[PDB]
Amino acid sequence: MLLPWLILIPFIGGFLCWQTERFGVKVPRWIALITMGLTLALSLQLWLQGGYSLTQSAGIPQWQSEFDMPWIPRFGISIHLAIDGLSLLMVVLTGLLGVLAVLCSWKEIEKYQGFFHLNLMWILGGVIGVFLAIDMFLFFFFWEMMLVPMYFLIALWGHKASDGKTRITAATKFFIYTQASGLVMLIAILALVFVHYNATGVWTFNYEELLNTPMSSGVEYLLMLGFFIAFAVKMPVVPLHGWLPDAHSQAPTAGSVDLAGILLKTAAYGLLRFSLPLFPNASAEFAPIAMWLGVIGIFYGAWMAFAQTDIKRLIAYTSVSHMGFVLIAIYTGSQLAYQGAVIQMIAHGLSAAGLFILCGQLYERIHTRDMRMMGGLWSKMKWLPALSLFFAVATLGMPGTGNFVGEFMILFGSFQVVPVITVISTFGLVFASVYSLAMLHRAYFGKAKSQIASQELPGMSLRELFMILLLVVLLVLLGFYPQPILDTSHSAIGNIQQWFVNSV
Amino acid sequence: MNMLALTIILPLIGFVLLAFSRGRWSENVSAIVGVGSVGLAALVTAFIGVDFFANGEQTYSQPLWTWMSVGDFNIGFNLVLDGLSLTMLSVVTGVGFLIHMYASWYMRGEEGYSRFFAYTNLFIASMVVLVLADNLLLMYLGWEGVGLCSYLLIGFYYTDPKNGAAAMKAFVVTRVGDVFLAFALFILYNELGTLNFREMVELAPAHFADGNNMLMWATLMLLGGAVGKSAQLPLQTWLADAMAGPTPVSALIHAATMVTAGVYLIARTHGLFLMTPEVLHLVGIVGAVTLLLAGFAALVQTDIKRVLAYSTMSQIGYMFLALGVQAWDAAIFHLMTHAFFKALLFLASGSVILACHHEQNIFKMGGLRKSIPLVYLCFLVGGAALSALPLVTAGFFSKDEILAGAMANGHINLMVAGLVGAFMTSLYTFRMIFIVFHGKEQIHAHAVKGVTHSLPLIVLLILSTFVGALIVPPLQGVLPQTTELAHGSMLTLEITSGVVAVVGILLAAWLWLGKRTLVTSIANSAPGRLLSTWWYNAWGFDWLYDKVFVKPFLGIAWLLKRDPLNSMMNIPAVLSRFAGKGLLLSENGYLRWYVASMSIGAVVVLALLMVL
């Protein structure tokens, strides 16, 4: 019921901001803040009003709210929006990140600003629609239309048409690397539906009847690779992640909040929801390749993070290290491991968003991007580097932050299922420390005479500090007290694991 | 009595105030609130200590709230106040109170004031969490809680980057130990299910009827965690560099707060180490080889802070031996004495280096008895206890008891290790004060008189002596494995340690009382400098631990200065663009070749149809 409205407010707000662009220019900032407030209101209403602590073994079909509507009846394509417990965590996270995106874009007036915000709400609404998606075509359409408006963001707002490096390399690799694999998973969807159409005799694009379709061995394996390729180019996996640092280092850091904190979520959401239950034996065969790619991703991202000299590419290469833990979590037979991935995933968004906001904040203070050029700014800034120290501290497994409990319950479940690949995996924490300290010492520890421009520094406004203070206190409560959201996700995680166990 | 969290909340809450009053408060109000947080902590500790005496040494547990709970993974904020944990709380809430009360006077006159009293409270709060935790998880929060605080206090002065760069090697090394510590934590949950210490104690033998081979991996890798956080061979790197910070943080890190976490983990899991005897004796094996390393490096360099540091390394490993010889209560007795002397010994040195006015040398000062004898009596009391002197010292009973236990274990190499350690402690006992305080004062050390530090000096003077040795720590509430006692040979071992201490003290005084030309000759002899350079490298261990992984890490970072896999999956675009440019060049514009294209399409279509 609430789901059609909850995916449509982003699109309605873009229309109204661009409508009132003719009326005024200070309107869309204040319009956008209220519209994202309504998005979190409906999302938090579903958290509180709904039975978040529901039955742990109520089957694979279980939803607090559900919407159905005929869209293309010839294939049974329907607007099958349906919200689960873990999907509701995703919706509340993106509503909060949308508030941060529209708050960081405050006091940013240009030649056109309504165009920026209709695009801003369009891309955030696309991610919400992926998170509420049970029909395969609706899932794919939303997956691919959140991908078009970021291209305009990197192009027309990466820099205003002055340098050609903001389109022809950064934005173009971002677009092609995702869309080729999106078309791969579309033909994977179609091969799965056609083998189901031979089995039963109805053209259906719905998840519940495609869940248990009879397929011979050696056939569903190729479709599982087809799903995983599109789910491995969106979250950074080892062979195909070259788009991520270019995308984050060129887009404005509000666009980078969208590009890191929430676009990385949807691929592991799809690995939990759409790839694991549909292909149980194929995923059981593919598991060790996934573990090898996971350990390679953690070690690889940390080394490339240590070796880099700038900051946006630095945090962009932390992200590929973080997601390796999540991939190994998903491809195991443990309930605790999956519940560790969820808390690690929410904390991943919350620990990347603050760093990107602050890295963009530091650049507009000093007008210099290279990290090794500055140094010793602690005597000049009064609140930026202290808050930045805790966010760099929250990146690695420091307890009292959500990242520690996240990565570390994965390791418990991972050692429960398989010893040797887990005992390799744990060493990324040592490597997490070295790139964390490298960031901290190269940027803030030292003498302010490392740069001439490090001798005249501005002040920090109240609202940026307010939205940084909220994230640090929110992230500490998730580290100390993670029970409420684990009780929320228990049943959804449990039936996925029980199906992955029982179907093999 | 329902007041355990007040030993954590009251410090921790005070940190939050000083973390946001970033220098806007004045000197006095900031000083009072910083000391009063730790003062309330000691008072609440004393109330529960005297009530623990009223409890009849009965443990009191308090669960605040469950942390996380999955149906097979139950972790809760459980606090256990038993005899072992009460003693480890007593050291912290007294020593941190005394060290921090000195910092109320030492810190004033310079900036970074509210900042320093913010991070000290967090440092103390993390150490209290570690020793009161009942679950290995919550205790893990303690380990890297105090590690991050050591980073924030070693690199406290952010202006010059030497001390600003010295902290991260400690941070990297302590997280290697924490990875080693969490490895055993995974294995214990896989093998025995519950992480509570007592439920673990009488669940371990029930689950272990069949297979035992994997428990040595758990316990050996658990041991690798304990050793690293304080000081030991496999990971002894950072304690020389930790001296680059201010004097009060060196006392807190090195004396009794952070370095007393690796002792608490071995002691708390003593039954768990009794499940496997060889991993228990291996603690003493590594302890016996580190007393041979940690001693004479105090003599080598001319830095007073490096002197006090290699002595702490020697003493902590001396404990590991004491725990490896199944003398548990005696080791904590050694800790109860050890906290008192080391903190004062470190602190008094700071007062005089305030008076030194940027000297930082041991060979250019002398005749300091006439400057101020208060610091003279401070080093003196500390030296006597360390050397195992029988004259009204506090710690000599602890050394006598652990060597009695060690010879009751019956390991002649361990008594040889103990004998050479007693001789080696007496060597660097008085050599420092003889080379520094005796001679001629060509640079005057201006002494500073003030009651604000004199009163804690008198308190630390009356506490570090044998008057403080009469306070028996609570050890009857845990009922550990009983420290065995020997009679008849107790007097023989007592006089043997006294003779060893006296010979070492007389040799240092004979080094002093000579011309020192032979000392200069052995400080100029080429094999002497070879050993000095060899133990500058400290068995090459910092040398080995840098050149084994560091420049490979920098080399792979220099190979990762540009991202390889982003480039190597761009070759589809490279091939497509170059192949597209070739196809554009294939077009001509001359219409004869257009018709030739039509004929050559007809030729290939007919050929492709005739092969079908």
Side-chain angles (χ1 to χ4, degrees), chain A residues 173 177 239 242 300 304 306-307 317 339 378-379 383 389 393 396-397 399 408 416 426 437 441 445-446 479-480 483, chain B residues 20 67-70 144 148 151-152 158-159 164-165 168 172 175 183 186 190 553 557 560 563 565-566 569-570:
Chain A
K173 256 55 179 183
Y177 282 173
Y300 186 24
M304 187 66 204
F306 186 78
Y317 279 125
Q339 294 178 357
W378 202 309
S379 65
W383 282 71
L389 162 67
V393 161
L396 72 164
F408 197 74
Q416 263 304 100
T426 58
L437 58 85
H441 209 269
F445 289 148
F480 266 116
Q483 196 49 53
Chain B
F20 293 128
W67 183 351
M68 75 207 79
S69 53
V70 182
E144 67 272 14
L148 182 81
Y151 168 103
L152 291 177
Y158 66 98
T159 56
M168 284 75 75
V172 168
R175 296 302 285 261
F183 265 126
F186 312 153
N190 189 23
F553 174 58
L560 271 293
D563 170 39
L565 294 176
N566 169 36
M569 311 276 197
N570 192 31

Side-chain angles (χ1 to χ4, degrees), chain B residues 218-348 350 355 366-367 373 382-385 388 390 394-395 404-406 408 410 417-418 421-422 439 445 447 450 456 468-469 473-474 477 480 486 488 498 501 504:
Chain B
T219 47
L220 293 173
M221 173 75 107
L222 176 56
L223 173 53
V227 293
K229 187 73 177 176
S230 187
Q232 204 74 346
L233 194 97
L235 280 159
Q236 55 95 30
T237 56
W238 60 286
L239 282 73
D241 287 20
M243 315 316 295
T247 76
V249 304
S250 280
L252 278 170
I253 291 156
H254 284 248
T257 302
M258 185 265 222
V259 284
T260 65
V263 183
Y264 175 72
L265 172 54
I266 302 299
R268 186 68 259 172
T269 44
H270 63 273
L272 269 164
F273 272 106
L274 274 175
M275 300 311 264
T276 310
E278 61 90 15
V279 307
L280 182 62
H281 199 264
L282 191 151
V283 181
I285 286 177
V286 286
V289 306
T290 60
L291 276 296
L292 298 178
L293 167 62
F296 171 74
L299 282 300
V300 175
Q301 311 75 350
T302 176
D303 185 74
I304 191 66
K305 317 286 291 304
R306 286 183 172 81
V307 169
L308 308 156
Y310 297 140
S311 59
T312 55
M313 271 205 58
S314 164
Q315 294 286 346
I316 299 313
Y318 196 63
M319 306 193 62
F320 278 108
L321 184 52
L323 293 163
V325 298
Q326 308 98 62
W328 319 89
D329 291 331
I332 309 298
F333 204 76
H334 182 73
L335 188 45
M336 194 70 275
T337 62
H338 167 266
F340 310 149
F341 66 63
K342 208 50 75 69
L344 182 55
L345 193 88
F346 269 95
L347 273 193

Side-chain angles (χ1 to χ4, degrees), chain A residues 58-385:
Chain A
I60 304 166
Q62 59 178 27
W63 288 288
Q64 307 167 356
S65 200
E66 172 146 40
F67 185 36
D68 194 359
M69 170 196 267
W71 190 24
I72 304 168
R74 190 269 187 190
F75 311 97
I77 297 169
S78 61
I79 314 294
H80 203 249
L81 297 174
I83 172 170
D84 215 359
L86 59 89
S87 307
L88 176 48
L89 291 164
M90 296 296 172
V91 175
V92 299
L93 176 64
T94 181
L96 193 42
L97 285 185
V99 172
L100 274 69
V102 299
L103 269 171
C104 178
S105 67
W106 200 279
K107 272 167 269 175
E108 304 266 330
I109 187 64
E110 280 282 326
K111 173 70 163 172
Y112 264 117
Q113 184 269 9
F115 279 120
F116 168 54
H117 266 70
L118 70 89
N119 194 290
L120 205 75
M121 319 275 268
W122 281 3
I123 190 167
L124 291 169
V127 187
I128 290 193
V130 176
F131 280 142
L132 310 169
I134 300 299
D135 199 287
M136 312 294 304
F137 194 80
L138 189 67
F139 159 74
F140 173 63
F141 167 86
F142 272 112
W143 173 279
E144 185 178 1
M145 62 80 71
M146 67 181 180
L147 190 57
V148 64
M150 203 63 223
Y151 194 71
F152 265 82
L153 272 173
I154 303 180
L156 193 43
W157 290 85
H159 193 275
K160 277 288 194 167
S162 175
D163 45 354
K165 66 159 285 204
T166 80
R167 281 83 65 193
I168 208 164
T169 298
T172 316
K173 256 55 179 183
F174 165 71
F175 206 108
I176 297 169
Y177 282 173
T178 60
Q179 288 273 1
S181 311
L183 290 166
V184 159
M185 62 146 288
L186 174 66
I187 77 165
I189 282 182
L190 290 197
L192 175 69
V193 171
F194 184 77
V195 300
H196 181 239
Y197 186 51
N198 289 348
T200 61
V202 64
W203 275 111
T204 177
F205 272 19
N206 218 40
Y207 161 57
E208 296 99 13
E209 45 263 53
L210 283 171
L211 180 72
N212 72 47
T213 183
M215 294 178 71
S216 66
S217 62
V219 176
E220 72 267 62
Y221 200 94
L222 186 53
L223 311 196
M224 171 284 308
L225 313 171
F227 265 95
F228 182 76
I229 289 162
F231 291 148
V233 298
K234 186 51 74 74
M235 71 171 259
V237 193
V238 176
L240 295 174
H241 63 86
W243 61 279
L244 200 81
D246 292 331
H248 287 147
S249 58
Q250 190 58 48
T253 194
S256 185
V257 160
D258 301 346
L259 272 166
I262 204 67
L263 260 68
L264 267 70
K265 306 290 97 175
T266 81
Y269 181 46
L271 289 175
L272 267 166
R273 170 69 62 187
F274 280 126
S275 174
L276 211 45
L278 276 68
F279 310 106
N281 314 67
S283 173
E285 283 203 26
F286 195 52
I289 295 97
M291 330 285 287
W292 289 325
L293 268 69
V295 298
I296 288 297
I298 292 166
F299 277 88
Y300 186 24
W303 285 350
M304 187 66 204
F306 186 78
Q308 218 273 326
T309 184
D310 198 72
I311 319 165
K312 290 289 199 295
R313 314 191 73 115
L314 190 56
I315 294 92
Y317 279 125
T318 75
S319 296
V320 59
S321 64
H322 275 174
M323 291 335 278
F325 292 114
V326 192
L327 189 153
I328 297 169
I330 295 169
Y331 269 87
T332 51
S334 162
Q335 168 175 111
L336 174 64
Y338 295 9
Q339 294 178 357
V342 169
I343 183 65
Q344 207 269 356
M345 186 187 283
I346 301 299
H348 178 65
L350 293 179
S351 175
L355 274 174
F356 282 138
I357 283 180
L358 291 179
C359 169
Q361 204 94 30
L362 169 65
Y363 183 23
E364 65 183 1
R365 254 51 150 180
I366 71 168
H367 296 285
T368 292
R369 264 212 180 286
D370 206 343
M371 153 164 55
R372 72 188 189 275
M373 186 64 72
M374 53 205 168
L377 305 172
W378 202 309
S379 65
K380 301 272 190 172
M381 310 334 296
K382 55 195 289 288
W383 282 71
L384 164 71

Side-chain angles (χ1 to χ4, degrees), chain B residues 56 60 71 131 136 145 163 181 242 250 271 281 312-313 345 350 553 595:
Chain B
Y60 165 64
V131 293
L136 284 136
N163 51 7
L181 169 57
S250 280
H281 199 264
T312 55
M313 271 205 58
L345 193 88
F553 174 58
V595 188

Side-chain angles (χ1 to χ4, degrees), chain B residues 570-585:
Chain B
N570 192 31
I571 62 169
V574 174
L575 190 149
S576 74
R577 181 177 65 83
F578 277 131
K581 273 297 296 175
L583 259 59
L584 181 71
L585 260 61

